[PDB]
Amino acid sequence: KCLPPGKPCYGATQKIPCCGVCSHNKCT
């Protein structure tokens, strides 16, 4: 499923779509 809110994304190097966007190393 999509990543939950608060997940630290690593820039754009990952095949996992975040529910929101990358905010200060996070995912909304």
Swiss-Prot record:
The record's subcellular locations are: Secreted
Which cysteine pairs make disulfide bonds?
2-19, 9-22, 18-27
Domain of life of the native organism = Eukaryota
Tissue spec. comment = Expressed by the venom gland.
The record's function comment reads: Reversibly blocks N-type calcium channels (Cav2.2/CACNA1B) in rat dorsal root ganglion cells (IC(50)=40 nM). Elicits no toxic symptoms in either vertebrates or invertebrates during a period of 48 hours post-injection, when it was assayed in vivo by direct injection into mice and cockroaches.
Q: Which family does it belong to?
A: Belongs to the neurotoxin 36 family. 02 subfamily.
Note on domains (UniProt): The presence of a 'disulfide through disulfide knot' structurally defines this protein as a knottin.
Name recorded for this polypeptide: Omega-theraphotoxin-Hs1a
Taxonomy of the source species:
Eukaryota, Metazoa, Ecdysozoa, Arthropoda, Chelicerata
Q: Please indicate which part of the intact protein appears here, giving the first and last residue numbers and the full length.
A: 41 to 68 of 68
